[PDB]
Homo-oligomer: A and B are copies of this chain.
Amino acid sequence: MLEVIATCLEDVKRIERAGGKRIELISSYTEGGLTPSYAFIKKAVEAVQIPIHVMIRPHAKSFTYTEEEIEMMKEDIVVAQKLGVAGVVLGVLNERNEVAEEKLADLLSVVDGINVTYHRAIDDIENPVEAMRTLKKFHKVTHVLTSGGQGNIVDNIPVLTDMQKISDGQIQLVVGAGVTKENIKQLLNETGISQAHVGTAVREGKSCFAEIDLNLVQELVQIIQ
């Protein structure tokens, strides 16, 4: 499965057109992806037939959200669901840089039968493996987006392996960050992970302010095949 970040309506459409199979709908690539506005979610869902997973992330300053921010995210999840999203992308850490387990429960309390991707917050956790361990606790989590820790994703091929083992098919894993032409198959097959997440690698000049090049998107899709 090739999942591609979309920051604008034209992204969304070219994603589907070139053969991407899932969209991560964001505002602001520069800040790592934040919750997009009402009308963007609304229209993005209406534009294509491929799944839309919307980012639920109110700012990029940390993953330790106030209780007022947790409620804000719950209310964005509810409206997203109403708007037809295929899932939401989120992740909250406690002060230990580990999974905030009660805050996650509260977030998921409003979820009802869409996917849930715990995102690259999990990479800040001291042990993603133990992070993956604690994640498998929550039934509503269907996916996890990850690069297997910090530094670049190549070195982290073994962690990705272990949590794919750890997940034991429970949670669907998605490699994200530093994903390219060259490493994608190298990344997918060495770890056993079957879903990839890209952004710039398929933008013109690999720029998030550029448009989607339908060339670059299909090149990875076929590599995935």
Contact = CB atoms under 8 A, between A and B. Distances in A.
Interface in A37-91: 37-40, 42-43, 47, 58-61, 66, 68-69, 71-76, 79
A66 B27 contact: no
A202 B31 CA distance: 20
Nearest to A76: B39
Interface in A200-225: 209-210
A2 interface: no
A35 B209 CA distance: 16
Q: Copies of this chain, how many?
A: 2
Given A38-B76, A68-B43, A72-B39, A30 B27 contact: no
Interface residues of A, number: 34
5 contacts: A27-B31, A35-B36, A40-B76, A42-B75, A60-B209
Interface of A: 7-10, 27-28, 30-31, 34-40, 42-43, 47, 58-61, 66, 68-69, 71-76, 79, 209-210
